[PDB]
Amino acid sequence: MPSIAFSGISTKPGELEFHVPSVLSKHNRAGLLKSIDFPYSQRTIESSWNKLHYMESIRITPESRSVSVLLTDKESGDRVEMLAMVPLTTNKIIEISTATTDGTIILVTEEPHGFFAPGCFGKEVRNVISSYKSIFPHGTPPFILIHGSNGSVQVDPALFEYNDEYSVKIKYTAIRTEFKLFGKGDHGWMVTPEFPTISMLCQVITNAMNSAIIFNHDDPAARTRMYPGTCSNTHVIESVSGDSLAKALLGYDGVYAGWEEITIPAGMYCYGELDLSKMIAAKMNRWHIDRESSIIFRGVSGYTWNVTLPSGNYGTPEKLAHCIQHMMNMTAKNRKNPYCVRFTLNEGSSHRGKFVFVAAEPFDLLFGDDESIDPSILGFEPVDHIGRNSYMSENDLGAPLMKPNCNVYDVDEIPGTHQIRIGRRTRLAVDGKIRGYSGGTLRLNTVNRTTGAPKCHGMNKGDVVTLTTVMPAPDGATGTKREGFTFRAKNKIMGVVVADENENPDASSLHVSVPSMSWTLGIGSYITIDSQAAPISVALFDPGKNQFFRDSIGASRLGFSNGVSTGQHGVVVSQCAVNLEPRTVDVSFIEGSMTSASTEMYNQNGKSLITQVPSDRSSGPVPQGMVRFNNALQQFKLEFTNPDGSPYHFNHASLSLLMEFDD
Amino acid sequence: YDVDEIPGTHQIRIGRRTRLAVDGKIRGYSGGTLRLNTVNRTTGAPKCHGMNKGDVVTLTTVMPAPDGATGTKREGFTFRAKNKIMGVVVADENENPDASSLHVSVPSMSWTLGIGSYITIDSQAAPISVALFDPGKNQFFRDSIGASRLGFSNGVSTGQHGVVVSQCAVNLEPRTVDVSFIEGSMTSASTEMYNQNGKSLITQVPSDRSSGPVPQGMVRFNNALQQFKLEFTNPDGSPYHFNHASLSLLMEFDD
Amino acid sequence: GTIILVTEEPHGFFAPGCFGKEVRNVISSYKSIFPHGTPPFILIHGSNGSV
Amino acid sequence: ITNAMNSAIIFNHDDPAARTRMYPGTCSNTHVIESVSGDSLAKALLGYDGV
Amino acid sequence: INQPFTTQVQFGAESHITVNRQGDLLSWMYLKIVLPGLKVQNQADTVQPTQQSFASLDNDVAAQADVSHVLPYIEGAYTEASLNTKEQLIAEAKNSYEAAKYNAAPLPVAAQMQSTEMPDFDYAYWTEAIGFHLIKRAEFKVGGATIDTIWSELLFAMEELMGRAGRRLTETIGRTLRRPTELMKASRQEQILYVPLPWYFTKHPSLAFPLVAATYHNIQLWVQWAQLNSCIIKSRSNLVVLHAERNVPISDDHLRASLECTYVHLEAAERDALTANAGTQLIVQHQAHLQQVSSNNVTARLNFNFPVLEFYYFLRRKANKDAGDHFNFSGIGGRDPVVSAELLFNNTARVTQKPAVWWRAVQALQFHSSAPLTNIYSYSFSLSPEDPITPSGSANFSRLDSVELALTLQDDFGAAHDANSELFVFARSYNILKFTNGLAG
């Protein structure tokens, strides 16, 4: 019995090919595997499985609200188009007509209101918003009017009557206690809640379809499916169309397109060198700066400037780039060499891009200085970038796909259960200094309640905010006492965050459409601004369980079940302990390399194994594996599989095996 | 260079330190050559500059002292140019090479007015390339520590910013030792154990004493044996180093 | 209005034309070989600094 | 060096092998490489089997 | 009868089917493949832009590789030239290169400037002959033993040589004869392909596989699928490729396939006779030698076994493979990659050095139903290698100590950008399949 050492270098995950010397290529030999020198080179997180997918609440916008279904009648062959329109999260009122002889008011909206589904298949016109009372959690108001002189007003959806696609009737008596003046020229906002889950959105679309068509979301599969409901006997579904919502729900074999993606760096997270929980939190909070941080740069004159970035949520890389650009140009005072800072998307990508710093003259970015901001936020290495007029980040960063995160997350492992928890931080209200009020819009500079420094607010167009008189400073506040603007309303003052086309988007400048009050008397004074915190849903799948989430870290590794996990309070907890430990590796022959190998070892799936490599070098030697070869062997291929069935990653490590052959 | 193991990935990093500029006291200027004594920017003591003939340096007016500087305030020579002042480090055949004496060919300016004053001198920092090979992979790098031990691939790894990082974690742990017969000591030995290369093994010694006893190995000898030779190989195929240690083995023979 | 710059050592900027090829400026190729922003050539001793 | 050779001769460095190799480029049809000489650079690049 | 796979069908995976016993013999076998229609969207407009990379026409790696070979022959300031001036300089350098290497007379520059009229809109398409390219390997198994193996490259070579006039597989495999505009048109909608699997039993009715005689063996087809990244070409590098109906990024689970088998039902007397005595069938098996090419001189050591009827060989440039042109067996600038070849048995010339045209055109003219449109070379030991039932010559490679195919390739083949070009050699060999007591081997 000659023993032969075989050495191989893996060119592919999970597969090694070995050449048998011609001296041994005789027919009908048993090979005993004596030992494997296994490299244990597979990372806890590999570049092939480093994604986590999550979402907050689903906002309905003018571009993402409609699903159309073409139905064909089975008897006549006639074609009927069926449109579901979902109500907008925020819709502006453009006119309020005064009282017909019956005391009804007509409210005219900027966009089609979507409150009434057209009567179809002999059904009456259905109020879609009336169904929100049964779909949303208890205490969620189905509908709010903003701009009442008395504050925000919850209105029963059943009090609305259809007038046309852009206008609704309501009895003045239903709203009389609250309607005392819409200001001349700003008629306020219609507000509906954002959807906590795809399942709740599918129930509203089903109701807007008068249950002629049923939309169901399967959380275990992370898939939306459409079925014929009450029209199933009379009509066939021919096709589906619609806006960005229809494409998002159905365009990817029912997988929702609005999942935010984080990429975790490949590495060892089981040995305590890298903290996976902190890394997930850092990647979810990519556009949140916890503390005031400095960018250090030097111009051609040899003068070094320090630029202090405001703390808070920038929301998008473009808002961050623009803030850096603005602050660099203000600090350098030099109109002759304007610094330009931009985020640039990669060709063919909608959401991956790089930071680019440009000036007319050469300048240096001092990112190797310990007082500088962590350059990894900007995708740069922590080294000084010198002697160029242009710098582009080495690393690709992800911009938000739909809506930037309104939450900031902590990710921690629960002591004693070892369960991962993804929890939103307590959202702190911001103080806003009143800069001006014109045309129903209040202009505010947002500041940190503790320090009084500028604070990036993370709010976006169509966000609904609550306005209060300046709240007492938090315990341990170091900032100066702020003079509060005092206002009183019967109900909560709400406002809608609006874009202003005329002002540079400083991430600390906040513009809000607000009820007509004496806001001009408050110029220079402060108010407190709060916004609602969103739920979180996390989509996690083990390898091969879902075709869209194939590059996911794995549900089982993070202690999750395969599917969508939702936290209504912005907190999701794993069902099981986190398991990042190296796992056993099943070693088998690749089918078709041999017409017949007998083994005594089988895995749980009945697959023939040569051996099982232990999780680590300390667990003992690799078990001996007897293999019988029925034919003359010139070459054989070995397959190395993880217990999840994924291919083992050799990371360019070599492997050596010792086989003893019978005579 | 700083060399460190990256926390949580266990990857070795060979990184250049931030090259600190040196202050140079102007001693003299003659024939386009500026003569400088180099000093530490923090302490003001003499500092060896590491620069050599043909090095290209940038000259600036004395920069502000670093934070936490303990040295006395230095009087800076002020000069202005539209572009960066560069100079070439030159040898001076007439001066003893004190590693703190720096001679630079510089543009013709009023440098003689700066005698006794200070300027700041900076030089570009180089990239690094590291050549690492496992035993037997390259005939020239045969005495290399091994690419795989340091988490490197076999070959040249280049860091354009003077920083190179290993692809994998460092693995310095003792590895298993393959035990086999030397070919030609025996006309035929049958074994049930083979390594990954198809080489017949007697046994595989574990990485350490704590991993368990050495597996039993059955060997059949077809001939009368007066002597045998054993080969002990690491998993990389390199010979095991006994370091003058003795080894004992127990064999049971059939009757 | 041309200036001649005379060097201490052979400048090596021009490869001789061979095999029917024209004389090639070797330094002109540094713009495509070196990383972006590396100057292929600098003159030192300008009264205005490096060029 | 390949550009200074007008691509008549191609110099390639193989980083995995840490070896420099020389090949006939545009002269491959008309000429044969007889020998290589030069200063310390030629010896440094080619004298040790391309190491 | 159409039958689903026993395992999931996906790009880059292996799938198998256990063939049902719905008749007494198995005759024809087709892989029915369903490919979705393709659409494209800009990466900037996509909510999830992360997809596998595809070959793109704005990054023509094959054209860049061809330009790299003529760079030493470009006279003047190429780097600083306008685009139209660079195209002129490349066409002039091509004349100088071809004059120096081949003593070719110069072509007028205007005749070398073939604008392929590419459409001024965004598209993606399935690669040429996608029905063959999808089948990286298929194995016909009986009782767990592999009876025969076929490869994508072999299927294409077999259709080139044995494909009869008026019965070419064009539509059935998604082949347009390299007309990109037709591939684009076809790729906008769902495609149903019927790829014939040319097993020994599909070649003649008397060779139909006797299911009744093999009752105790499972019959299986195993298929290794091509990776999705290799199956698609796009107009531009920054495009995301979408499933045209579902409006989602194209993914590995969008491959659908089934097996269409023709069963034969026999009269009871013939069925009983065949069950009692199916005896032996003469079979043709396929063997493969696959080699990387890094030099203009290549020796392939053909370790094939059994009585070999014939062999095929051809080369693929790395640049053609990387461009997604998987069945482009041409050399540099579309030339013949082989200058000459020699066949040696035990270091003795069995066929002395012959030029490429002899191996490609003369061998095809003598022994095959068709001449190949691509650079496929053949050699037959058989007078009629396409006759599945009548042996007409062979060489027994199991009795030769060495069989060497020595190739002289074109200049610079396997150099620089074409390092790791591929040599394919396929052989057809006789064996015997025996049926006894409900078993086959």
Whether residue B88 lies within 8 A of chain C, CB to CB, comes out as yes
- CA within 13 Å, CB half, E273: 5
Among D12, D13, D14, D15, the strongest candidate for a mutation testing the B interface, having the largest count of B CBs within 10 A, is: D15
Q: How far is CA A549 from CA A307, A532, E401, in A?
A: 40, 29, 53
Query: What is the number of CB-based contacts under 8 A between chain B and chain D?
Result: 21
Q: Hey, are the CB atoms on E248 and A261 less than 8 Å from each other?
A: no
* Rounded Cα gap, residues A282 and E311, in angstroms: 60
Whether residue E32 lies within 8 A of chain D, CB to CB, comes out as no
- What residues in B contact D48, CB-CB < 8 Å? 140
| Token duo for residue D12 | 């390639």
- What residues in C contact B107, CB-CB < 8 Å? 44-47, 49
- CA within 13 Å, CB half, E16: 14
Length of chain A, please?
A: 663
Of A79, A59, A58, A78, the residue nearest A69 (C-alpha): A79
Identify residue A54 by its one-letter amino acid code. Y
CB A555 within 8 A of CB A646: no
The set of residues, in sequence order, having a beta carbon less than 8 Å from that of A580 and lying 6+ positions away, is A44, A269, A270, A276, A557
Distance to chain A for B193, nearest Cα, Å: 3
Distance to chain C for D26, nearest Cα, Å: 9
| Token duo for residue A504 | 């540079």
Helix (H, G, I), strand (E, B) or coil at A386: strand
* Rounded Cα gap, residues E344 and E404, in angstroms: 5
Planar angle of CA E348, E354, E355, nearest 5 degrees? 155
- What residues in E contact C32, CB-CB < 8 Å? 79
Of A648, E81, A56, B251, the residue nearest E89 (C-alpha): E81
In the 3-class helix/strand/coil scheme, how is chain B assigned residue by residue?
A: CEEEECCCCCCEEEECCCCCCEEEEEEEEECCEEEEEEECCCCCCECCCCCCCCCEEEEEECCCCCCCCCCCCCCECCCCCCCCEEEEECCCCCCCCCCCEEEEECCCCCHHHHCCCEEEEEECCCCEEEEECCCCCCCCCCCCCCCCCCCCCCEEEEECCCEEECCCCCCCCCCCEEEEECCCCCCCEECCEEECEEEEECEEECCCHHHCCCCCCCCEECCCCCCCCEEEECCCCCECCCCCCCCCCCCCCCC
Length of chain D, please?
A: 51
A35, A273, A383 member nearest B195 (Cβ): A35
Instruction: Tell me the angle at which helices E61-70 and E83-102 cross, rounded to the nearest 10 degrees.
Output: 60
Distance to chain D for E66, nearest Cα, Å: 14
Identify residue E276 by its one-letter amino acid code. A
Q: How does DSSP classify residue A645?
A: S
| Token duo for residue A591 | 């089918």
Q: Hey, are the CB atoms on C15 and D8 less than 8 Å from each other?
A: no
* Rounded Cα gap, residues A123 and A477, in angstroms: 60
Q: What is the DSSP secondary-structure string of A431-487?
A: EEEEEEEETTEEEEEEE-TTT-SBEEE---TT-EEEEEEPPPPPTT--SPPPPBPP-
Q: Hey, are the CB atoms on B156 and D18 less than 8 Å from each other?
A: yes
Of A37, A620, A613, A611, the residue nearest B212 (C-alpha): A620
* Rounded Cα gap, residues E417 and E58, in angstroms: 18
Q: Hey, are the CB atoms on A33 and B193 less than 8 Å from each other?
A: yes
- For residue D8, the surrounding DSSP H or E stretch is none
Planar angle of CA E87, E88, E93, nearest 5 degrees? 95
| Token duo for residue D26 | 């545009």
Q: How does DSSP classify residue A272?
A: S
A255, A551, A592 member nearest E146 (Cβ): A592
| Chain C residues with CB within 8 Å of chain E CB | 20-22, 28-29, 31-32
Distance to chain D for E72, nearest Cα, Å: 5
| Token duo for residue A347 | 């060709």
Of A494, A489, A490, the residue nearest A442 (C-alpha): A494
Identify residue A212 by its one-letter amino acid code. A
C20, C21, C28 member nearest E79 (Cβ): C28
CB A213 within 8 A of CB A121: no
Residue that is written with structure tokens 């999750």 in the block: A560
Residue that is written with structure tokens 């890394």 in the block: A279
* Rounded Cα gap, residues E21 and E26, in angstroms: 9
What determination technique applies here? cryo-EM
Which residues 7-46 in chain C show a CB within 8 A of chain B?
35, 42, 44-46
Residue A421 C-alpha from the chain's centroid: 16
The end-to-end CA distance of chain E, in Å, is 26
| Chain D residues with CB within 8 Å of chain E CB | 6-8, 10, 23, 25-30
CA torsion sign for E111, E117, E123, E128 is negative
What is the pairing mode between strands A126-127 and A397-398?
unpaired
A569 dihedral zone (left: phi>0; alpha: psi -120 to 50; beta): alpha
Helix (H, G, I), strand (E, B) or coil at E94: helix
The set of residues, in sequence order, having a beta carbon less than 8 Å from that of E414 and lying 6+ positions away, is E293, E294, E295, E296, E298, E420, E421
CB B127 within 8 A of CB B163: no
* Rounded Cα gap, residues D8 and D2, in angstroms: 8
Q: Does D touch A (3+ CB pairs < 8 Å)?
A: no
Which residues 360-389 in chain A show a CB within 8 A of chain B?
368, 381, 383-384
Residue A302 exposed, middle or buried by CB count within 10 Å (0-12, 13-18, 19+) = middle
* Rounded Cα gap, residues E388 and A560, in angstroms: 58
Q: Does C touch D (3+ CB pairs < 8 Å)?
A: yes
- For residue E83, the surrounding DSSP H or E stretch is helix E83-102
Subunit partners of chain B (3 or more CB pairs within 8 A)? A, C, D
Of A189, A388, A424, the residue nearest A288 (C-alpha): A424
- For residue A513, the surrounding DSSP H or E stretch is strand A509-513
Using CA coordinates, name the residue in chain D closest to E99.
D29
Q: What is the DSSP secondary-structure string of E103-158?
A: -PPPPPHHHH-------SS--EEEPTTHHHHTEEEEEEEETTEEEEEEEHHHHHHH
CA torsion sign for E146, E151, E154, E159 is positive
CB E421 within 8 A of CB E338: no
Q: How far is CA A196 from CA A535, A549, A566, B148, E42, in A?
A: 6, 21, 9, 50, 30
* Rounded Cα gap, residues B156 and B144, in angstroms: 13
Q: Does D touch E (3+ CB pairs < 8 Å)?
A: yes
Using CA coordinates, name the residue in chain C closest to B87.
C44
- What residues in C contact D13, CB-CB < 8 Å? none
Measured from the Cβ of residue E357, the count of other Cβ atoms closer than 10 Å reads 13
Measured from the Cβ of residue A486, the count of other Cβ atoms closer than 10 Å reads 11
- What residues in E contact D8, CB-CB < 8 Å? 72
Of E224, E225, E242, E226, the residue nearest E234 (C-alpha): E242
Q: Hey, are the CB atoms on A660 and B201 less than 8 Å from each other?
A: yes
Residue that is written with structure tokens 């302490």 in the block: B43
B221 dihedral zone (left: phi>0; alpha: psi -120 to 50; beta): beta
- CA within 13 Å, CB half, A537: 21
| Token duo for residue B212 | 């368990």
Of E429, E424, E388, E387, the residue nearest E154 (C-alpha): E424
* Rounded Cα gap, residues E78 and C29, in angstroms: 11
Which residues 81-100 in chain E show a CB within 8 A of chain D?
100
Residue E171 C-alpha from the chain's centroid: 16
C12, C19, C33 member nearest D26 (Cβ): C19
What does residue A235 show for φ and ψ, rounded to 5 degrees? -125, 155
Q: Hey, are the CB atoms on B168 and A41 less than 8 Å from each other?
A: yes
CB A502 within 8 A of CB A521: no
The set of residues, in sequence order, having a beta carbon less than 8 Å from that of A420 and lying 6+ positions away, is A277, A411, A412, A413, A414, A558, A559, A573, A574, A578
Distance to chain A for E137, nearest Cα, Å: 10
What is the pairing mode between strands B33-39 and B101-105?
antiparallel
The reported resolution of this PDB entry, expressed in Å, is 12.0
Whether residue E79 lies within 8 A of chain C, CB to CB, comes out as yes
Distance to chain A for E281, nearest Cα, Å: 20
Which residues 102-161 in chain B show a CB within 8 A of chain D?
131, 133, 138-141, 153-156, 158
CA torsion sign for A191, A192, A194, A198 is negative
* Rounded Cα gap, residues E403 and A110, in angstroms: 82
Residue D20 exposed, middle or buried by CB count within 10 Å (0-12, 13-18, 19+) = middle
Helix (H, G, I), strand (E, B) or coil at A625: strand
Distance to chain A for B11, nearest Cα, Å: 9
Subunit partners of chain A (3 or more CB pairs within 8 A)? B, C, E
CB E289 within 8 A of CB E303: yes
| Token duo for residue B80 | 């202005």
Using CA coordinates, name the residue in chain E closest to C29.
E79
Using CA coordinates, name the residue in chain D closest to C14.
D4
In the 3-class helix/strand/coil scheme, how is E335-379 assigned residue by residue?
A: CCCEEEEEEEECCEEEEEEEEHHHHHHHHHHHHCCCCCCCCCEEE
Helix (H, G, I), strand (E, B) or coil at E432: strand
Planar angle of CA B141, B142, B143, nearest 5 degrees? 95
* Rounded Cα gap, residues E22 and E41, in angstroms: 46
Measured from the Cβ of residue A167, the count of other Cβ atoms closer than 10 Å reads 17
* Rounded Cα gap, residues C40 and A248, in angstroms: 50
Measured from the Cβ of residue B72, the count of other Cβ atoms closer than 10 Å reads 9
The set of residues, in sequence order, having a beta carbon less than 8 Å from that of A492 and lying 6+ positions away, is A151, A152, A466
Identify residue E372 by its one-letter amino acid code. P
Query: What is the number of CB-based contacts under 8 A between chain C and chain E?
Result: 8
- What residues in C contact A390, CB-CB < 8 Å? 36-37
Length of chain C, please?
A: 51
Among A68, A225, A253, A588, the strongest candidate for a mutation testing the E interface, having the largest count of E CBs within 10 A, is: A253
Helix (H, G, I), strand (E, B) or coil at A190: strand
Q: Hey, are the CB atoms on D28 and E416 less than 8 Å from each other?
A: no
Distance to chain D for B175, nearest Cα, Å: 25
CB E317 within 8 A of CB E410: no
Distance to chain C for B81, nearest Cα, Å: 5
- What residues in A contact B176, CB-CB < 8 Å? 35, 37, 621
What is the pairing mode between strands E256-264 and E25-35?
antiparallel
| Token duo for residue C47 | 């009264």
E72, E415, E416 member nearest D26 (Cβ): E72
CB B187 within 8 A of CB B225: no
* Rounded Cα gap, residues E175 and E189, in angstroms: 16
